[PDB]
Scaffold this active site. Structure first.
Site, PDB file in Angstrom:
ATOM      1  N   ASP A   1      -5.088  -7.655 -12.453  1.00 25.37           N
ATOM      2  CA  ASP A   1      -3.727  -7.591 -13.036  1.00 25.37           C
ATOM      3  C   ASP A   1      -3.188  -9.007 -13.057  1.00 25.37           C
ATOM      4  O   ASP A   1      -2.739  -9.471 -12.008  1.00 25.37           O
ATOM      5  CB  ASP A   1      -2.855  -6.649 -12.203  1.00 25.37           C
ATOM      6  CG  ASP A   1      -1.392  -6.654 -12.596  1.00 25.37           C
ATOM      7  OD1 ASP A   1      -1.015  -7.371 -13.549  1.00 25.37           O
ATOM      8  OD2 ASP A   1      -0.645  -5.917 -11.931  1.00 25.37           O
TER       9      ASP A   1
ATOM     10  N   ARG B   1     -13.215  -6.868  -9.448  1.00 23.94           N
ATOM     11  CA  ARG B   1     -13.621  -5.958 -10.564  1.00 23.94           C
ATOM     12  C   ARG B   1     -12.423  -5.732 -11.500  1.00 23.94           C
ATOM     13  O   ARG B   1     -12.632  -5.436 -12.692  1.00 23.94           O
ATOM     14  CB  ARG B   1     -14.183  -4.624 -10.030  1.00 23.94           C
ATOM     15  CG  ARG B   1     -13.191  -3.752  -9.265  1.00 23.94           C
ATOM     16  CD  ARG B   1     -13.586  -2.313  -9.042  1.00 23.94           C
ATOM     17  NE  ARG B   1     -12.482  -1.647  -8.358  1.00 23.94           N
ATOM     18  CZ  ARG B   1     -11.399  -1.136  -8.969  1.00 23.94           C
ATOM     19  NH1 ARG B   1     -11.306  -1.114 -10.286  1.00 23.94           N
ATOM     20  NH2 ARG B   1     -10.431  -0.624  -8.248  1.00 23.94           N
TER      21      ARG B   1
ATOM     22  N   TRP C   1       0.811  -1.234   0.000  1.00 25.45           N
ATOM     23  CA  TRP C   1       0.000   0.000   0.000  1.00 25.45           C
ATOM     24  C   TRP C   1       0.839   1.277   0.000  1.00 25.45           C
ATOM     25  O   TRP C   1       0.227   2.338  -0.020  1.00 25.45           O
ATOM     26  CB  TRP C   1      -0.930   0.003   1.207  1.00 25.45           C
ATOM     27  CG  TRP C   1      -2.013  -1.003   1.067  1.00 25.45           C
ATOM     28  CD1 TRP C   1      -1.966  -2.303   1.482  1.00 25.45           C
ATOM     29  CD2 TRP C   1      -3.327  -0.774   0.546  1.00 25.45           C
ATOM     30  NE1 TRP C   1      -3.166  -2.906   1.233  1.00 25.45           N
ATOM     31  CE2 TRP C   1      -4.016  -2.000   0.652  1.00 25.45           C
ATOM     32  CE3 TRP C   1      -3.995   0.337   0.027  1.00 25.45           C
ATOM     33  CZ2 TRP C   1      -5.326  -2.153   0.238  1.00 25.45           C
ATOM     34  CZ3 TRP C   1      -5.297   0.177  -0.398  1.00 25.45           C
ATOM     35  CH2 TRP C   1      -5.948  -1.055  -0.303  1.00 25.45           C
TER      36      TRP C   1
HETATM   37  O1  UMP Z   1      -5.298  -6.634  -4.870  1.00 20.83           O
HETATM   38  C1  UMP Z   1      -5.147  -6.100  -5.967  1.00 20.83           C
HETATM   39  C2  UMP Z   1      -4.947  -4.696  -6.186  1.00 20.83           C
HETATM   40  C3  UMP Z   1      -4.773  -4.249  -7.439  1.00 20.83           C
HETATM   41  N1  UMP Z   1      -4.797  -5.075  -8.547  1.00 20.83           N
HETATM   42  C4  UMP Z   1      -4.573  -4.440  -9.875  1.00 20.83           C
HETATM   43  C5  UMP Z   1      -5.745  -4.428 -10.840  1.00 20.83           C
HETATM   44  C6  UMP Z   1      -5.435  -3.155 -11.628  1.00 20.83           C
HETATM   45  O2  UMP Z   1      -4.340  -3.391 -12.515  1.00 20.83           O
HETATM   46  C7  UMP Z   1      -5.048  -2.191 -10.503  1.00 20.83           C
HETATM   47  C8  UMP Z   1      -6.180  -1.526  -9.717  1.00 20.83           C
HETATM   48  O3  UMP Z   1      -6.509  -0.174 -10.246  1.00 20.83           O
HETATM   49  P1  UMP Z   1      -7.886   0.171 -11.061  1.00 20.83           P
HETATM   50  O4  UMP Z   1      -8.262  -1.090 -11.760  1.00 20.83           O
HETATM   51  O5  UMP Z   1      -8.871   0.665 -10.150  1.00 20.83           O
HETATM   52  O6  UMP Z   1      -7.530   1.252 -12.040  1.00 20.83           O
HETATM   53  O7  UMP Z   1      -4.272  -3.055  -9.637  1.00 20.83           O
HETATM   54  C9  UMP Z   1      -4.994  -6.458  -8.423  1.00 20.83           C
HETATM   55  O8  UMP Z   1      -5.014  -7.280  -9.356  1.00 20.83           O
HETATM   56  N2  UMP Z   1      -5.158  -6.874  -7.117  1.00 20.83           N
END
Ligand code: UMP
Ligand code: NDP
Ligand code: NDP
Ligand code: DQF
Ligand code: DQF
Ligand code: UMP
Lengths: 534, 534
Positions: free
Chosen positions: A442, A439, A333
């Protein structure tokens, strides 16, 4: 025209890890200890062995006997109930208890210089030399021939190139061993299939297949007609996924992750984003991991868990103070708590590392007024974490067992809105399953950690409710591969998973709030070398 | 042997619906229109032209040698392979010169009034069906397709010379004067059903009728990896006779029917909040392509007036049950009664004041609910407005979510929402939607829920100047009520019809501006109404 291909000669073995770290196939090489197996009893490998070495297909023997005669320049081979041959070393044969011999529905052969046929039958054949097997197979009706080993038997059979396939069981635990399976030259043999991962007798294992390298059809046309409208979309080549596309059976559950990477790389939509890097994206996937059989920590690269366990403990305390994690060198974080990151979120009146009403706060205090990360929120808002644990304990058939982090009111006050929208729980026959809806996924960096996090949490909730964990079900909304991950994931997809580890919790912890970093043990984690995704 | 099996004689046709209806009954004979004034009843359905050409031109060389032996054996005998196509003289004369003879096929014309001297083209003329059979014996060909005339289809079916009918269902009505013969359910039964498509402003699918009888090394490896293959429930085989007789079930309605099947065969027996008990499972995904069809189930009758009125009431932000009761929509009547509200401990709630449910959370999340008459303008978060603004101005956002699960307000709702959230996805001018449903009544609720969120996806796409792409339905606790089992056994033995289409008034530019008359469901073909309960 080769002897192994004519007489269908195969090796079948089970190899554990050996007490003495870089991992490779040779990690699994333990065969025997003091003329016995290095392990107690692994009942699932027993059942696999029996099923492989006894299975026969009658309607396929014609082609086999034809080939064997044609190659021996004979016209006939010579009960009529077709069976497999099974070859054993002497020490191996004498290892087997007496009443377990001879091995049922199999023609038992025994390589030995010092046994002789006239103290056994001619049911139970003997041979003085290797070449005496080829001779005896030439005179026999049999489906396939399985070398059940002894380190000696396997060594001489492999170096003499008499093995077509190795049926190799990976026993994912360490035992005292005095005999080893020989090192499989990955120029001579290659893995073409990998099984599901299983737990038997307190170890995980899988089943892989090495193959000798090559150095009504009315309804079949109807299939073609139904594909009349079917459709490189993205600049991804074939040669790129050579090992990945070479495997026939890819049943290891790590392929639920790898197959989604493959699908986004082949079929994904090219999109800009917030980050300015560009992604390939698709929308809507499900993965399911059987927590009763393994802990699904990716094996095709190295993953670390201390930081993601600390994050979960910090969620459960209902904390929003980024410094708590930074003080333990957990930096998940850190970038979301900088002056610059908060000012860009228009959080001008937010202290550095005050992440706002994120997960911790929504899990323990949903609907309470957020002030700052130091305030006392005790008995403020809805304690969703307590409510779901109470529902699991007291109303397990509830369809309302949900933990939701997506507080629409508070979203703009969070350093960022949650990726992990909700967990839903299901209880049946003393077992707990968890769906997590994500939602934003990555696939290269975040998703491997996210699977670990929610698998650990499913075990934590199960243990504090006296349930056994069943399935972790991961639902991916916007599922993306960062263009700066594409080379790294190309490397990763051409790696063959290892059997998965197991998670052990301190069995003494009975309340969700009582877990500490020392209460979590990953066991038997065998993994390929670390990849930097960028 | 049989003439149609030796010579591999198939029929291929395309049939539309025919002008003769508020109560109209539907059966396979609904699709019977062939022609009009000696041409096709419709202008051009290009996808059927594509399918027609792929089926009538496809050959499998490696399969021919086996057909040659079959035909040689039946008769007492010893450039590219092509199919034969047979047409009626009227059919032949309808085809434009530039498409005649049909390319890469051996063309055959049935005529009494015309002889080979009357044709310039490379075609065979036959004045008798019997002479086709003689000709087939004399040709090298893959398969033989009867291309029609009504007169031709009629006589080849009458004579039982048809092995399979490749039948296109054109789901639109046109003026016809010639008709495909009524098929005898005892002579021919459906074995396969394709995906549903849109082409030239109609939906269509492709079904196959069959004449009723009134390295193979990795094949062993597949069995090995299957060695651990163990149906829970007291469901009988013959109960799913039609369902399980189909070879290809590619109609997207099978995504629904297959989930019903899976729960009946593998579901977990559980009590529920209700007392009926269910069979349940956890975690499914369905995907519906809204560019190709509107997924309104065809295996029973559904009306949409109520669910459209409910969706418009949601969008207005209303919580007043009386508004739906005054339109004779009773979807929420049971949840607004004195008894229901008191059993929820809402002693201080007026009858039919449903509390801060869907509409309120969509327009005013985080506002304090008072009563169903209050003016909540500019109170709470207008999520609906925010997601429309994100779709228009920030389309690659991974934060485009609409959430009804407001943890703070759940106990004030007549009941907590089943439909937790909608997440949106935008690529290349097209809008996709994921809805996550915590609790899914497969027999009664899910059919309506699919239609609801499919309509909503169309409404949001239109007001954002996008085309609808996929509606993705994620099911958490998915259950069949024990009282629905016998009605669903009936439903699952019904073959889906091609889906209808949904049209919206294109003049509607704001989400708040839709009225009941702005929605048309067109070409809904359905099986009979089923009472799910006794
Ligand atoms: O626990 C987590 C936190 C973040 N992300 C990735 C997804 C996206 O690449 C980005 C989150 O940002 P937004 O999708 O809200 O733009 O980080 C994950 O896969 N897992
Ligand atoms: N994990 C697994 O999959 C397996 C494990 N095991 C374990 O492995 C151990 C057995 O292995 P190991 O010690 O290598 O003993 P082996 O079973 O390989 O026995 C070797 C003996 O077989 C005979 N032999 C070997 N080669 C020839 C030849 N070319 N011609 C004639 N005879 C030959 C000789 O016996 P002689 O000359 O004395 O007659 C030789 O000393 C045990 O601990 C057993 O439980 C065994 C099988 C599989
Ligand atoms: N939607 C679809 O899939 C299809 C639609 N069509 C449409 O169908 C209509 C044409 O159908 P229809 O009017 O029934 O005419 P047909 O195409 O069935 O042809 C009838 C003619 O073919 C000849 N014929 C048929 N049977 C025999 C026989 N057993 N021996 C000798 N000659 C025979 C006769 O020609 P003669 O008079 O010379 O003796 C007869 O008058 C058109 O509107 C066409 O567009 C056609 C095929 C498919
Ligand atoms: N995949 C795979 N491949 C293989 N070659 C073998 C194996 C291992 C040792 C001996 C033999 Cl015959 C086979 C196995 C182990 C499961 C089968 O093991 C058996 C079968 C019958 C008797 C037997 O000996 C029991 C006691 C031996 C002891 O005390 O260690 C072991 N799996
Ligand atoms: N599934 C299915 N099965 C079938 N038997 C036929 C069909 C319909 C009419 C004539 C012919 Cl040869 C075939 C089709 C219609 C699509 C194929 O349409 C064609 C192909 C080649 C020529 C042709 O002629 C135009 C007819 C007169 C007009 O233009 O209205 C139509 N689909
Ligand atoms: O749009 C709706 C509303 C309700 N249900 C069903 C699911 C459950 O059978 C029941 C709600 O019960 P709980 O899960 O809240 O107990 O209604 C649906 O399928 N769709």
């Amino acid at each position: 025209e080769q002897v192994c291909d004519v007489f269908d000669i195969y090796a079948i073995c089970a190899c554990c890890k050996v007490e003495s770290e870089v991992f490779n196939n040779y990690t699994f090489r333990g065969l025997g200890n003091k003329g016995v197996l290095p392990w107690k009893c692994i009942s699932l490998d027993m059942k696999y062995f029996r099923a492989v070495t006894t299975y026969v297909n009658e309607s396929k023997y014609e082609k086999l006997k034809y080939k064997r005669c044609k190659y021996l320049n004979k016209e006939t081979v010579d009960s009529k109930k077709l069976q497999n041959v099974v070859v054993m070393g002497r020490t191996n044969w004498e290892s087997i208890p007496k009443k377990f011999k001879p091995l049922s529905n199999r023609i038992n052969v025994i390589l030995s210089r010092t046994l002789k046929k006239e103290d056994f039958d001619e049911d139970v054949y003997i041979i003085n030399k290797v070449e005496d097997l080829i001779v005896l197979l030439g005179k026999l009706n049999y489906y396939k021939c399985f070398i059940l080993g002894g380190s000696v038997v396997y060594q001489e059979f492999l170096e003499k190139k008499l093995i077509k396939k190795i049926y190799f069981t990976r026993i994912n635990s360490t035992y005292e061993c005095d005999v080893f399976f020989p090192e499989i030259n990955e120029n001579e043999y290659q893995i073409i299939s990998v099984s599901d991962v299983y737990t038997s007798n307190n170890t995980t294992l899988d089943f892989i297949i090495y193959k000798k390298t090559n150095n009504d059809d009315e309804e079949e046309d109807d299939f073609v007609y139904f594909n009349f409208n079917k459709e490189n979309k993205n600049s991804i080549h074939p040669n790129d996924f050579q090992i990945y596309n070479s495997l026939k059976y890819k049943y290891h559950p790590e392929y639920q992750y790898l197959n989604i990477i493959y699908d986004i790389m082949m079929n994904g939509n090219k999109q800009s984003d917030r980050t300015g890097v560009g992604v390939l994206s698709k929308f809507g996937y499900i993965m399911k991991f059987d927590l009763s059989q393994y802990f699904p920590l990716l094996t095709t690269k190295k993953l670390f868990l201390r930081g993601i366990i600390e994050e979960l403990l910090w969620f459960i305390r209902g904390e929003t103070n980024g410094n708590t994690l930074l003080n333990k060198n957990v930096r998940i974080w850190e970038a979301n708590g900088t002056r610059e990151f908060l000012d860009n979120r228009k959080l001008f009146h937010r202290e550095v590392n005050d992440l706002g009403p994120i997960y911790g706060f929504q899990w323990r205090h949903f609907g309470a007024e957020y002030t700052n990360m130091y305030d006392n929120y005790e008995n403020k808002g809805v304690d969703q974490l307590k409510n779901i644990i109470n529902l699991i304990k007291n109303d397990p058939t509830s369809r309302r067992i949900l933990l939701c982090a997506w507080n629409v009111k508070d979203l703009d006050q969070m350093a960022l809105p949650p990726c992990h929208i909700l967990c839903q729980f299901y209880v049946f026959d003393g077992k707990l399953s968890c769906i997590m809806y994500q939602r934003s996924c990555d696939l290269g960096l975040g998703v491997p950690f996210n699977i670990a996090s929610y698998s650990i949490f499913t075990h934590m909730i199960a243990q504090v409710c006296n349930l056994q964990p069943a399935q972790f079900i991961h639902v991916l909304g916007n599922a993306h591969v960062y263009n700066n991950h594409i080379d790294s994931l190309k490397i990763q997809l051409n790696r063959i998973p290892y059997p998965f580890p197991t998670l052990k919790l301190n069995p003494d912890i009975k309340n969700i709030e009582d877990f500490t970093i020392s209460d979590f043990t990953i066991q038997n984690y065998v993994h390929h070398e670390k990849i930097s995704m960028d």
